[PDB]
Design a binder for this molecule. Sequence first.
Ligand SMILES: CCCc1cc(=O)n2nc(NCc3cc(-c4ccncc4)ccc3Cl)nc2[nH]1
Ligand SMILES: [Zn+2]
Length: 361
Amino acid sequence: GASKLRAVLEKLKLSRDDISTAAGMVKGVVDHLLLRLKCDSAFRGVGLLNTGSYYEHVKISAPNEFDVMFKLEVPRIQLEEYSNTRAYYFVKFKRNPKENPLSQFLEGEILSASKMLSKFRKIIKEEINDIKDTDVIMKRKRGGSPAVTLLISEKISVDITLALESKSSWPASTQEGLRIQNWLSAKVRKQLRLKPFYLVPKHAKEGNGFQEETWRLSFSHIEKEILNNHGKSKTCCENKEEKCCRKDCLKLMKYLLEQLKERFKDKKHLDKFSSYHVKTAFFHVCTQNPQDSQWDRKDLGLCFDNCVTYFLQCLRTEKLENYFIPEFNLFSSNLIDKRSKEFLTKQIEYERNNEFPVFDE
Ligand SMILES: CCCc1cc(=O)n2nc(NCc3cc(-c4ccncc4)ccc3Cl)nc2[nH]1
Ligand SMILES: [Zn+2]
């Protein structure tokens, strides 16, 4: 229970404090790459997404695996939804009397993620080789991923993702999403929806089996802003008497899935689940339990159980709405077959019934 879950959280804290030297190395490589990329005519306006914060850790049990997002603003973007999939869009340009450098990535009237990533990757590979103050290598592209992956010092890996930034209003598919009014208030929802949105290249293994040049909506800056300002109280987690366990529960949900994917990495059944699914379910639980008193630190075990049982319910009913785009069902059988969700249900039920053996040291 709570005492065991606390021990888990404490062990993961230890490894995070150690990797600050690794973060220093990552930041040094990323800053060199941005300086070089900004010299290119097509990537002139590239920059860090979450400029203050280099890097996230997608995988909490892999402290030496870093994730960084670059953003590239494209003004006057014209988006064309793909086959009413709600999440995937062709990117087109508006009126064309002025041509600009990004047109070198056009395929017809459509902005090609392939072409853009090819030049992106080529510049990084060149510049990585021209670095000599630290040993960094570029890893070969895996069949699906659009990310550029660097390996630093034999054990630090960095996934770099290039996102397009649009400063216009969010696409209409988001209009009924981000249902935070009863938790964080309607005016915070309005404020958040005034920020830009992002488009990222999709995986090859992602989508309808074609290699169409569609882009996927991305709201990772919104996820980050909410987690850093997450209470109903404006002073949640800013004093002794207002320490909640929201972030802890999310960490534990991520770690649960990571451990189970590892325990079963021989089989194929868990390959389609990722932190994305656990994060989505967590945010729904925050919507469902908006009071800070529902997240008291003393109740860590009960709050974590709440997150687990909600996730189990989503698996069993095969319904998990995207937090921003409610019509997109992460758990549709078009995306994950029923037997895979049934298998994960079985494993999470086993863990819950046995006080989570997959956690203990
Ligand atoms: C705060 C809740 C978690 C969250 C963070 C975030 O950054 N985003 N970004 C979107 N964009 C919409 C979208 C994304 C994907 C997707 C497919 C594959 N790998 C990732 C994402 C599939 C369908 C849809 Cl509709 N959703 C989210 N949720
Ligand atoms: Zn808090």
